[PDB]
């Protein structure tokens, strides 16, 4: 068995497809003694040689050399003489000191994740490595997990905490991975940003201290993503070793690098500390998210492939993850709270003309929905705006030939509804507290079981009783005034207790109707991470639809996720975040990097515009394939200081490149841009001029780029290999 | 007076040699609108545009402008909608909320410090500004202090949190000085090393995210000063 | 050492209060004793520079920086101790050879210059020391004498810095009409021409005489121009520039 | 045929082992349109595109986008509009305008090269492409040459100028190499430093204006070397493309690399402009030296190994480039100039002892050559200090089993010496000035045939009647006063007449005596390049001796050359030019990196120190197969910055791997060593603790590696593979 788990006399190999963790048990402690490529008959060449450290103590007297200070592990705790961040902490009897000590291993086949919150899947070829430890004082059982995959570059990890004593404990700290690398030059790879910029890759060294990204927001958040890669000095797009450890969880996260005072390094990933402390009763037990880690050894390219395949495999609904996804449009910048009957079949019969497959009905159908002010939970149809029943404008559209998508905000509730004037109370808040308020609306506490069970059945019915192909989740606001419990420590539990509760929602409505579409959104890329996209095969990247704006945000967004999962919509000038002009043929390809979609009122459009748009759909049927289902390479990077951005698109016999120039340049000479993964001795046509390049001179020669004078201009290249 | 502390209609000046510290009360909210070399006169050319930030909340329904996740603070609180690092969170009742307001600010002359714990001496010409904060619903008081020096470019600092409620209350965070700087390309520098090789000056650039040092050793520590420029 | 196994409260709540109560309690105990006996000079300590901090610098108005006395290893950790911390309080001890820490033979001038950049003790059995050796230390320690004012209570200023590349330190210190300058090369070097070093805060107009030379120099010229470093073949060579304003 | 020279219709490919060079033939101007991996069915993809560039002018009035200004070339002329740096340039009537233009191409196999200049051997597996230029008015013919390696990735290229008018005219530049790159990111490495420092490895960013290395010192130098790698950004030791340019001329030199208005980037190497002129009578030609490009994109590494292969292959005699060369003594430091005969058989007495193969008489055995005042020039032998004939001293080292070397300094003259006495129209001097003196010694003329002539008859009759095994040919001082022209004309051709009479000397002596061992020298690496390398095979790198100054100047002269030329000797303490101890054990260790010797006088050893020695040359007789044959891996590069040197080595089934640290460290984690190159499924075998390792655990986990406290120690870990 070239993969899985084994146990060799005191070391655990957990073996994925070219990445191993290998483990020593030494006395009761959990030594990380290799992580990387795949290693057998490991004998201990790159050991931590033990010394004496000043102030570095010792569970002995009389031996000064052992320290959990100065051996790599894989969790962390505080008190025993380690003084890098603890990745578990709990509080029992007078005390926060456990010390969690190995007694048993076990191998597990198949299935296998935490209850009630998002887990790989196709999991018939792995192992899972259960290492049990006990803390015999504080009657309390810590077992890790950690599952091989056979077909990916990626290991899982997750935790169970299990309170055996006759006393309630506190859980303060509980992350789902941690590790401790040599020490080494490194630097680390995130993605950070802003509302209208997410994603945002930063590239920094790495250096003595802490850095960390984390949300205290209750959602994962747009300006920091769940993910952190270690990478070697010097790492490239082709070369070099890459570590990425990520988090399946869109609540409170926090990732962190330490360099501590030997130059060594600890790099984690789990639930945020901040707004959490979890109570166990006797026999009650706790279990984390999910935590990815996984490598590559060719650059920020590879590691790119190792996340999107893993994603593609093992986490995106299998429904899904191989269906081209229909074109669509959405009326929201469109028309905003301002529409009805008459309008909507107008806009459907000129989506149908230019060749748009699917039409989604935004905000503004529900309650008293005509601003952002109010309705936000009474999902009741507006028959008068909508000019009849929602089921009556459905069966028009779909007898137009389109499907039919609708957007909800289920988590949200306004002051200004029914659900509010009912229920009060459903509203995260504190007593004797004014309300935090945010776009003017306020959050349903999904903690409370009635607010879920409420949900299920408001949703469940929307969704029986109607012929919906799609549905847009949105969710406009981050978490404020926690003070919903019955005490402190509810409250305290209140945060990580709504994301179960939104998780139970949407696995059992994405469970219970599995033929729909589901596209998650949070203002955009909002909760753009892996949690979610366990769920939602697609997710709204970011609100800013500017063609030259959106350059960074899908460099980022497709960073670790594929393609296929990044909606990206055409639409009006001028860009209404940014203020500008581009050319429609850059925002047709800008787009087309994506998930593509068209946001804009299609009834007042010129006769050409429309002309150009049914251009844009044709060609798009054409590169759906390529784009939502190939190789993506990143040719040059959209970022901070770069003028231009190139991506290419693999897919047997098809290759694409798509070129775009933010500046006009002047007395410049022209870019030469060689494409990547192509057969050298390959012959490839190039539509556009009918020539026929080997695949060696497209890689090693490659093309000058040509555009004339203006702004945001761009090109796409076209290649059939013959 | 060159030198001191002086009150002028909303706007506190904390005036040291060749430093001021300008807040503004702003509505029992305290702003930071100016920390750097003297100005008098003080008119607000640096001061916060406000605008409505993306999923930046509000204290009431219809001021969208108005963000404590986007004002200059001197200190930090969480769950009012500042989304940054807290300095001050106390746990009292279900909740750690508190909403710490403006209510009230004395000078004193001279003397002065927290009981037990170091504190800078030779105070003859000195004054500290007391700014006097209470959460009305938690029944809890934050005292702000800042002193001048007349001699130095330097202010100190430090708070009193007064429990005046009927229960137990319990502090999370309380650190002794924060300050909110405008976005600019900045370096920090710090003192780290080890043992054997302590105080190893640090420099880098500050970047998205979170930087910190820190001591969990009960001492400060080989590794690092408590210090950052 | 540090605080491992907190857990002494009657609740968790005492536990989480117990390291700020073990610090009240230090503060407590050493503001009583320096109070009580304000005659005797305290200097603060952790295995060298574990708690060199503004808290204990209120009651200990010396430190004793690190336990590496090595007169090389010691310059990154003068650079950082004294750098928002005054030399007075940053205690520096001429150590024996080889140096204990590092495995290393240093000039028995290089230790001198290095130590006379903080606040100078010695720490080594003067009584295995030869004739030579123990003259060496008192010519040190007369020179010293000397140097002290200045050192102790006059104005540093860096002139370069033993950070991770250099190869090189010099700091400088004014006192009134005393202006001293100790320059430390770590690396021997070859075929590599002299550093040129620039002195700081000097008048433009005054006359700086070179003790070992007898030269006198405008400040102008020793700021705007400054001196040619000029060093034999060897590591850990140090040398010292001493100037009187006329 | 894979390799080799094409013509197809306007395109000329020169086809090495994964490397091409494509030029298009347009209207009689060469175009350089791909260098770089190999392409088939070249179409141009990366053509320039023709645009109207301002002031970029034109050969007909009526095409604005045709400009030499603008199109990539593989030589440069001026004042035709293309105002790059030029680099053949010649003045006849009144003007230095030329206009060459091609008129024929031809296609030679085999062996082919410049008259009186070092080139290629073992050409049997090539073809040469012969381009033929001619300006019609100026009746003048440019023939480019351009042969292909079949079994490495370079190229190599020369020229030949005809004078086919009536009148004299002056070639005023005439570089060997050019080529027009892309504009994109660069940076350059060369190697520069200084005596004493040798070779440092410079690598810095390309910038818009000119960046050169030059030598106006008529010969290469300490401070450059005949060297430029063109890199794409970022490249690393494992990854990047990386383009060396090299010149086999030990001369003056320039290479340059100039980023013009537009972007490009032009590099050239050749014959300095500076001090050259050359004359040309109606019928006459010039060749200029031969210049290789040599490509890799396997990074830094991967240029090392293709530059050191072709060196191994193609310039360094075949007759000592896979020959283990002796372990040698040589007494300069041991003694300087006071000896006599008692000492030196002493000596030898103990360099037997200790296994030494080879012993080398140094400076002062000739003349009146007490000192470094005198003598130079008067290659007669000392008897009285020799105690009799050399004959019967070289008898007496034969026969206590060594080897016999001679020191020489062929090219110089000493004021103090018969030979000025008879001869000081010989040095190179201005009539009518004072001469400039250096170690008090003046350089002869080697343009002036009479001292030519003079020299082989002296050597000539050195070598025939003694018995001598090996040679080193130093060189200590460089040329000043060039006046020696009947004209002025004359005086500009000196410095280049004077390095063919070098070549012809050196070239016959190590001809007609192939048997002797010759190694070069001038004041250690002064003159360390391709053009000396030619003939002798091994040098020596340096004077420095310093176990630690010698890690960067081993890095630089070896990055580019094969390891088995790199001359290092064990020399005693303190050292001679730092001032410093160093363990023997790190002498020895850093010394057997390179091609080992000894310089110290081993009579005044002690008894351990002498066994320490003999430990040394054992081990070396062990290692000097897999350093001298094998294959060299940089593991941590000793630069500025850099505490810590380790080399590795493979050999078949060997591999070791030297680790040096320069300064102590403390607090600090130990360093981890990864090894390269070696099967992943291959069992090491650990010398010194019997461990067995797999290739994966060494190259993917590693090395702790493990030391005392203090400066300058070192470790050696020996594998075999099982």
Known sequence: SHMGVRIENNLFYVESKNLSLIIENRNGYLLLKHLGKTIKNYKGSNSVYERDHAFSGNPTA?????????????????????????????????????DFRFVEAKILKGQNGPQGLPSPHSMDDTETLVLMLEDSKAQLSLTLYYT????????????????????????????????????????????????????????QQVEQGIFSISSNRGASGHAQTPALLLCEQGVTEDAGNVFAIQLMYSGNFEAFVQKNQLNEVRVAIGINPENFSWKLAPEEYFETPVALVTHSDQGLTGISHESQNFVLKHIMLSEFSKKERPILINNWEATYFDFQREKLLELADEAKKVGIELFVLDDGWFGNRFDDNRALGDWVVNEEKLGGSLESLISAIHERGLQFGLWLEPEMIS?????????????????????????????????????????????????????????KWDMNRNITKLGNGLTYLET??????????????????????????????????????????????????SDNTDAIARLPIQYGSSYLYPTISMGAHVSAVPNHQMGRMTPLE?????????????????????????????????????????????????????????????????????????????????????????????????????????????????????????????????????????
């Open 586 to 722: 850059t925002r047709g390809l800008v787009a087309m990097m994506g998930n593509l979609g068209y946001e804009l009122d299609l009834t007042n459009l010129s006769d050409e515009e429309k002309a150009t748009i049914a251009n844009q759909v044709n060609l798009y049927k054409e590169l759906r394939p390529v784009v939502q289902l190939g190789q993506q390479y990143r040719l040059i990077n959209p970022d901070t200081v770069s003028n231009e951005a190139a991506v290419q698109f693999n897919y047997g016999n098809q290759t694409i490149v798509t070129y775009v120039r933010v500046l006009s340049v002047v007395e410049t000479m022209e870019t030469t841009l060689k494409l990547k993964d192509l057969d050298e001795e390959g012959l490839y046509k190039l539509q556009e001029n009918g020539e026929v390049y080997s695949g060696a001179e497209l890689m090693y020669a490659g093309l000058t780029v040509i555009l004339s004078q203006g702004d945001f201009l761009s090109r796409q290249y076209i290649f059939r290999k013959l």
């Open 62 to 98: 009389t031996n000064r050399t052992f320290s959990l200070d100065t051996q790599r592990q894989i969790f962390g705790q505080h008190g025993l003489g380690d003084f890098r961040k603890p990745t578990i902490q709990v509080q029992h009897s007078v005390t926060e000191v456990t």
């Open 492 to 541: 305290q539990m209140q945060s990580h207790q709504y994301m179960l509760g939104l998780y139970e929602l949407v696995s059992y409505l994405t469970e219970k109707h599995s033929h729909i579409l589901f596209e998650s959104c949070s203002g955009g890329g909002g909760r753009n991470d892996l949690g979610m996209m366990r769920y939602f095969p697609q997710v709204w990247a």
């Open 415 to 471: 002051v200004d509804s029914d659900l509010y004037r009912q229920h009060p109370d459903w509203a995260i808040q504190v007593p004797g507290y004014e309300h935090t308020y945010s776009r003017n609306q306020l959050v349903l506490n999904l903690a409370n079981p009635q607010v879920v069970e409420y949900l299920k059945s408001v949703l469940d019915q929307l969704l029986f009783y109607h012929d919906i192909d799609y549905i």
């Open 148 to 203: 091989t995959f056979n077909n990916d570059a990626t290991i899982a990890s997750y935790s169970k905490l299990d309170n055996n004593s006759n006393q309630e404990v506190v859980i303060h700290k509980d992350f789902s991975f941690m590790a401790d690398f040599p020490a080494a030059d490194y630097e680390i790879v995130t993605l950070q940003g802003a509302y209208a910029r997410e994603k945002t890759v930063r590239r």
